[PDB]
Amino acid sequence: LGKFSQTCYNSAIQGSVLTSTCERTNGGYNTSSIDLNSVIENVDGSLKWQPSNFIETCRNTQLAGSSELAAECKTRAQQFVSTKINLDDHIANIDGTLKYE
Amino acid sequence: LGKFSQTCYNSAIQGSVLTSTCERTNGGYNTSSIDLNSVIENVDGSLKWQPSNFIETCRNTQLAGSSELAAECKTRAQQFVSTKINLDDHIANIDGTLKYE
Ligand code: NA
Numbered sequence: 001l002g003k004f005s006q007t008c009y010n011s012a013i014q015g016s017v018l019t020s021t022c023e024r025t026n027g028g029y030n031t032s033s034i035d036l037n038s039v040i041e042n043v044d045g046s047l048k049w050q051p052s053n054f055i056e057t058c059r060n061t062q063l064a065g066s067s068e069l070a071a072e073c074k075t076r077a078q079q080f081v082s083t084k085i086n087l088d089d090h091i092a093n094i095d096g097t098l099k100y101e
Numbered sequence: 102l103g104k105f106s107q108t109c110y111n112s113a114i115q116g117s118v119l120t121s122t123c124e125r126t127n128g129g130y131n132t133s134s135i136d137l138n139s140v141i142e143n144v145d146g147s148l149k150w151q152p153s154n155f156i157e158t159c160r161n162t163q164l165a166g167s168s169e170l171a172a173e174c175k176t177r178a179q180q181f182v183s184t185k186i187n188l189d190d191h192i193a194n195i196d197g198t199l200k201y202e
Contacts, residue, residue, distance in 0.1 A: 001202065004194040005168040013164045016156045022194040030197030036170070038139040038151065039201045040186060042158045045176035047186040050153065055117050055138045058148070063114035066106040069137075075146035085141060085148045093105040093123040096131030100140045101102060 038100055058083075067091070139201060159184070168192075 004020065005011065011020040019033040041050045058073035059080070067088035072080045092099050106112065108124035117138035122130055142151050159174040160181070168189035173181040193200045 002189045002191045002193050004192045004199055005189050007194050008199075011164055011167070013162050013170065016162065018164075018188065018192065018199065020194075020199060022197045022199065024197040028197075032198040034192065034199045034201065035135070036188075037156050038153055039191070040155055040170070041153050042155050042174045042184075045174045045180070045182040045184055047155070047159075047170065047172065047174065047184050049186075049191060050139060050151075052138050052151075053143055054141055054148070057143050061114055061116060063112060063119075066112060067104075069114060069119075069141075069148065071148065073143040073146050073148065079146075081146045083143075083146060083148045085150075087119065088104045088106050090103045090140070090150050091105045091119070091135070092103045093108045093121075096123045096125040096129075096133065098105060098109070098119065098121055098123065098133045098135040100135060 035100065063087075136201065 008020040008022040016037040017035055021029055021031045023029055039050055040047050058071045060072055062070045064070045067086055069085045069087050073083050074080055090100055092101060109121040112121040117136055118134055119137055120134040122132040125131055140151055141148050159172045162172045165171045168187055169185055170188050171185045174184050175181055191201055193202050
């Protein structure tokens with residue numbers, strides 16, 4: 001559904017970063033931001049949205065230790081198996097901000 | 102390339118969201134989060150990092166109007182052309198916080 005600009009203002013892009021000042025559900029405001037590097041993609045010169053399947057096919061997410069993600073996900077033979085990934089692998093700290101590279 | 106957890110503490114995974122409080126470059130701290138649904142994916146049951154080429158093949162990004170990304174991207178034949186996309190198609194404000202949905 002999207003529609004952020006409807007309830008936001010003073011938006012800006014910088015590199016692939018988007019930042020805006022957005023209304024709460026109460027009456028105040030907050031300034032967040034999203035990296036668009038992992039959400040849009042370039043196909044022959046045109047931008048498109050990227051598909052994803054983590055929220056929709058995996059479950060019961062958890063952090064083990066300092067940088068290990070753990071969950072259970074759905075296979076091709078449509079059964080849930082246990083899987084794990086080191087988030088240190090590609091998640092970095094870039095001046096107090098968490099960044100995917 | 103990566104290894105955030107050597108300057109971050111108190112990390113937490115909730116849903117697809119990772120949250121951590123990190124070491125600013127000077128001496129201080131900042132608490133961030135990154136939505137992993139667009140960073141990792143599941144391939145037959147196993148979680149894999151997702152590749153993407155936007156900032157790697159595109160340049161000169163601009164917010165045009167209220168909600169439109171504009172940029173120039175390289176076509177398979179290595180030529181920069183024009184390309185826009187409406188961010189409001191999937192960027193949302195969830196309680197003062199921008200989300201991709
Ligand atoms: Na992605």
